[PDB]
Design an enzyme around this catalytic site. Structure first.
Site, PDB file in Angstrom:
ATOM      1  N   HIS A  41       0.839  -1.226   0.000  1.00  0.00           N
ATOM      2  CA  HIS A  41       0.000   0.000   0.000  1.00  0.00           C
ATOM      3  C   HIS A  41       0.865   1.265   0.000  1.00  0.00           C
ATOM      4  O   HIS A  41       0.260   2.340  -0.011  1.00  0.00           O
ATOM      5  CB  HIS A  41      -1.068  -0.017   1.106  1.00  0.00           C
ATOM      6  CG  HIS A  41      -0.535   0.095   2.492  1.00  0.00           C
ATOM      7  ND1 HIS A  41      -0.463  -0.990   3.331  1.00  0.00           N
ATOM      8  CD2 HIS A  41      -0.100   1.155   3.203  1.00  0.00           C
ATOM      9  CE1 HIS A  41       0.026  -0.621   4.499  1.00  0.00           C
ATOM     10  NE2 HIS A  41       0.251   0.695   4.448  1.00  0.00           N
ATOM     11  N   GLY A 143       3.105   6.264   9.846  1.00  0.00           N
ATOM     12  CA  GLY A 143       4.527   6.315   9.458  1.00  0.00           C
ATOM     13  C   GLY A 143       5.257   5.031   9.829  1.00  0.00           C
ATOM     14  O   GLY A 143       6.314   4.808   9.278  1.00  0.00           O
ATOM     15  N   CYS A 145       4.330   1.838   9.326  1.00  0.00           N
ATOM     16  CA  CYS A 145       4.123   0.749   8.332  1.00  0.00           C
ATOM     17  C   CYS A 145       5.474   0.358   7.726  1.00  0.00           C
ATOM     18  O   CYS A 145       6.303   1.263   7.444  1.00  0.00           O
ATOM     19  CB  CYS A 145       3.144   1.166   7.243  1.00  0.00           C
ATOM     20  SG  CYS A 145       1.431   1.083   7.836  1.00  0.00           S
TER      21      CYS A 145
HETATM   22  C1  LIG Z   1       0.638   2.591   7.629  1.00  0.00           C
HETATM   23  O1  LIG Z   1       0.029   2.659   6.350  1.00  0.00           O
HETATM   24  C2  LIG Z   1       1.624   3.739   7.716  1.00  0.00           C
HETATM   25  O2  LIG Z   1       2.303   3.845   8.722  1.00  0.00           O
HETATM   26  N1  LIG Z   1       1.715   4.672   6.701  1.00  0.00           N
HETATM   27  C3  LIG Z   1       2.479   5.921   6.656  1.00  0.00           C
HETATM   28  C4  LIG Z   1       1.753   6.177   5.327  1.00  0.00           C
HETATM   29  C5  LIG Z   1       1.102   4.783   5.373  1.00  0.00           C
HETATM   30  C6  LIG Z   1      -0.548   2.748   8.606  1.00  0.00           C
HETATM   31  C7  LIG Z   1      -0.243   2.560  10.092  1.00  0.00           C
HETATM   32  C8  LIG Z   1      -1.402   2.821  11.060  1.00  0.00           C
HETATM   33  C9  LIG Z   1      -1.962   4.244  11.143  1.00  0.00           C
HETATM   34  C10 LIG Z   1      -2.284   4.467  12.606  1.00  0.00           C
HETATM   35  N2  LIG Z   1      -1.457   3.474  13.287  1.00  0.00           N
HETATM   36  C11 LIG Z   1      -0.974   2.527  12.487  1.00  0.00           C
HETATM   37  O3  LIG Z   1      -0.241   1.570  12.837  1.00  0.00           O
HETATM   38  N3  LIG Z   1      -1.558   1.769   8.179  1.00  0.00           N
HETATM   39  C12 LIG Z   1      -2.738   2.144   7.685  1.00  0.00           C
HETATM   40  O4  LIG Z   1      -3.120   3.310   7.706  1.00  0.00           O
HETATM   41  C13 LIG Z   1      -3.612   1.029   7.117  1.00  0.00           C
HETATM   42  C14 LIG Z   1      -3.614   1.038   5.600  1.00  0.00           C
HETATM   43  C15 LIG Z   1      -5.013   1.385   5.132  1.00  0.00           C
HETATM   44  C16 LIG Z   1      -5.884   1.604   6.355  1.00  0.00           C
HETATM   45  N4  LIG Z   1      -5.001   1.272   7.484  1.00  0.00           N
HETATM   46  C17 LIG Z   1      -5.304   1.228   8.791  1.00  0.00           C
HETATM   47  O5  LIG Z   1      -4.460   0.967   9.631  1.00  0.00           O
HETATM   48  C18 LIG Z   1      -6.736   1.559   9.201  1.00  0.00           C
HETATM   49  N5  LIG Z   1      -7.315   0.373   9.801  1.00  0.00           N
HETATM   50  C19 LIG Z   1      -8.443  -0.179   9.352  1.00  0.00           C
HETATM   51  O6  LIG Z   1      -9.010   0.146   8.327  1.00  0.00           O
HETATM   52  C20 LIG Z   1      -9.030  -1.310  10.200  1.00  0.00           C
HETATM   53  F1  LIG Z   1      -8.140  -1.810  11.049  1.00  0.00           F
HETATM   54  F2  LIG Z   1     -10.071  -0.895  10.922  1.00  0.00           F
HETATM   55  F3  LIG Z   1      -9.430  -2.316   9.433  1.00  0.00           F
HETATM   56  C21 LIG Z   1      -6.814   2.818  10.094  1.00  0.00           C
HETATM   57  C22 LIG Z   1      -6.106   3.987   9.404  1.00  0.00           C
HETATM   58  C23 LIG Z   1      -8.294   3.181  10.290  1.00  0.00           C
HETATM   59  C24 LIG Z   1      -6.171   2.619  11.470  1.00  0.00           C
HETATM   60  C25 LIG Z   1      -4.446   0.008   4.878  1.00  0.00           C
HETATM   61  C26 LIG Z   1      -4.986  -1.185   5.646  1.00  0.00           C
HETATM   62  C27 LIG Z   1      -4.044  -0.325   3.453  1.00  0.00           C
END
Ligand SMILES: *[C@](O)(C(=O)N1CCC1)[C@H](C[C@@H]1CCNC1=O)NC(=O)[C@@H]1[C@@H]2[C@H](CN1C(=O)[C@@H](NC(=O)C(F)(F)F)C(C)(C)C)C2(C)C
Ligand SMILES: *[C@](O)(C(=O)N1CCC1)[C@H](C[C@@H]1CCNC1=O)NC(=O)[C@@H]1[C@@H]2[C@H](CN1C(=O)[C@@H](NC(=O)C(F)(F)F)C(C)(C)C)C2(C)C
Ligand SMILES: [Cl-]
EC number: 3.4.19.12
Lengths: 306, 306
Positions: A41, A143, A145
């Site tokens: 992603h 951040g 991920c």
């Molecule tokens: C991860 O993508 C990241 O760190 N990024 C920096 C740019 C992308 C992120 C980590 C999350 C955010 C909050 N704490 C974390 O550990 N992961 C995501 O945002 C993740 C990406 C989308 C939606 N994501 C979710 O984690 C969401 N969860 C859900 O939809 C669910 F768990 F309910 F199912 C949210 C943002 C609501 C927590 C995808 C899964 C591809």
């Protein structure tokens, strides 16, 4: 003496952490030999993520669309492919700090260290368990991920987790390094919930052995139980069943302390039925289930890593 | 989201750990530039330690009496001196992995990461506080002496602790890197006990702010208190006094959450007087006092280190 939640030394993994940017999305990658592994992603915008066609979005990307940085050095992407939920970016430089390593898919109940990273830079290290419901109780902000979890066996780093997402109740879900999710989670922003969790019984018994070793013995009763009559009580308190395999794994700690596994099961049964009456075990007012029998032995025998 | 006891990444310190042998005594040393720092009781046999004359035992030692190994490489000692309770072995090789570093003497209340080592090899990493009674609640077996505690500021490793000894109740005591003990302890095998400890109030309030940030808000009441009327209740429960300095340090977390420090003091006062009625805060059934305001900000804002 003393008993602490103890992570593996992180140095071998620190040398493998990079920043992967694709457009407006930045996250962490793992640089092993001439491949960078990251969550797929990275190729999404924050709105793509509701329901992304990953195979499609990737078609549309050239090698140059991926900006991989290791400190102040840009690494040139010369190839890219998808393996389940993980991207593989072939780079033109083999990581000189690549440790000896393996990709392992761990079992529910097993622990590992997480090296939490932002922008390819390590923030901190902590120990986690893969919960029976295939979540971990992590600490991750946006951040994080691409942050990874690992075990060290002497010289060999065993990579078992890559961080993808956060579920309701602030627990975390992700993949092995072949990009298959632990549990039923999908990498899309929709309604997903963890199954109801269970307590990892074998781990609670390992922690009780740790308490005895450290001299905290108040909870030892004079009774025994059968495996069957233990697993009936366990079931009421949402504890997973204890198997003969579990009993065999507790062998070393049982031998070291002279307390039979089924005698310790008798003590845990009383704690579950009567609670702790305001007393603590190893500083804790709740039963701990995130130390494996191996973790207890390592810490209470001083196992080291090169 | 999530809140974990989180250590600093250990890689910068791993590169500095060596094994020091003097006769039948082996322990860990810290190799910075061309100096190895270790506890001075490396020069004792296990019976010398009842009441050793260190200045005398050292007179009797030549450079060759110290066997320093960094992996499979022997380092040649070309000089040796004592600075308080720490030995300095000048070696013929500058450590190529010497990070940017400082020696700091931390204050009671401040946290640090311990890299637990046996035979110059890292076992694991965990986070600790310097207790008001100048002990730490560590995990150390025989062989861990010379293990160090540290903070990382971006690129700079701030060494604050070297491990020497274990006191009754399984708590730990040692020195800064200039070899002065924290608290009143001496490096000799005699009757020594920790003073009665106190709870680090400013740290409990920082942890309550962490709980609010993570959405655990049940314990917030509708009241305020004066600093004076808080510190009277605190005193009964063996909590250290909260100073205006402490209030100023809690400024960022107070501003981020919109809860005045004296309002949070009102909530902590109720928790101390009424207990938690079987509820948890951030998974915990006891108030936690080993997270500083800085530790909370770092973890809940994602500060990283190069
Ligand atoms: C991860 O993508 C990241 O760190 N990024 C920096 C740019 C992308 C992120 C980590 C999350 C955010 C909050 N704490 C974390 O550990 N992961 C995501 O945002 C993740 C990406 C989308 C939606 N994501 C979710 O984690 C969401 N969860 C859900 O939809 C669910 F768990 F309910 F199912 C949210 C943002 C609501 C927590 C995808 C899964 C591809
Ligand atoms: C440390 O010397 C070590 O690791 N060594 C490998 C050879 C030397 C050792 C660490 C201790 C042992 C158990 N857990 C630890 O962290 N430190 C000492 O043995 C220490 C050395 C002697 C006596 N030491 C003690 O720690 C003792 N404590 C006390 O006398 C007291 F705390 F009660 F005061 C014992 C061994 C009883 C725990 C000196 C202080 C020089
Ligand atoms: Cl607890």
């Amino acid at each position: 003496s003393g008993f602490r939640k103890m992570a593996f030394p992180s140095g071998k993994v620190e040398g493998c952490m990079v920043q992967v940017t694709c457009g407006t999305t930045t996250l962490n990658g793992l640089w092993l030999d001439d491949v960078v592994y990251c969550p797929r992603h990275v190729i999404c915008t924050s709105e793509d993520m509701l329901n992304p066609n990953y195979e499609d979005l990737l078609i549309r990307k050239s090698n140059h669309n991926f900006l991989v940085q290791a400190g102040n050095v840009q690494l040139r992407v010369i190839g890219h492919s998808m393996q389940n939920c993980v991207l593989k970016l072939k780079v033109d430089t083999a990581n000189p700090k690549t440790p000896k390593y393996k990709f392992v898919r761990i079992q529910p109940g097993q622990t590992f260290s997480v090296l939490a990273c932002y922008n390819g830079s390590p923030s901190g290290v902590y120990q986690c368990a893969m919960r029976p419901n295939f979540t971990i109780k992590g600490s991750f902000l946006n951040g994080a991920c691409g942050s990874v979890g690992f075990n060290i066996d002497y010289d060999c780093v065993s990579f078992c987790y890559m961080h993808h997402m956060e579920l309701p109740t602030g627990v975390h879900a992700g993949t092995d390094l072949e990009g298959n999710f632990y549990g039923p989670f999908v990498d899309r922003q929709t309604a997903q919930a963890a199954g109801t969790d269970t307590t990892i019984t074998v781990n609670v018994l390992a922690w009780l052995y740790a308490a005895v070793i450290n001299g905290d013995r108040w909870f030892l009763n004079r009774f025994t139980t059968t495996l069957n009559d233990f697993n009936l009580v366990a079931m009421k308190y949402n504890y997973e069943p204890l198997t003969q395999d579990h009993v065999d794994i507790l062998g070393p700690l049982s031998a070291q302390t002279g307390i039979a596994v089924l005698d310790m099961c008798a003590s845990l049964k009383e704690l579950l039925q009567n609670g702790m009456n305001g007393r603590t075990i190893l500083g804790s007012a709740l039963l701990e289930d995130e130390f494996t029998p191996f973790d207890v032995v390592r810490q209470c025998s001083g196992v080291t890593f090169q």
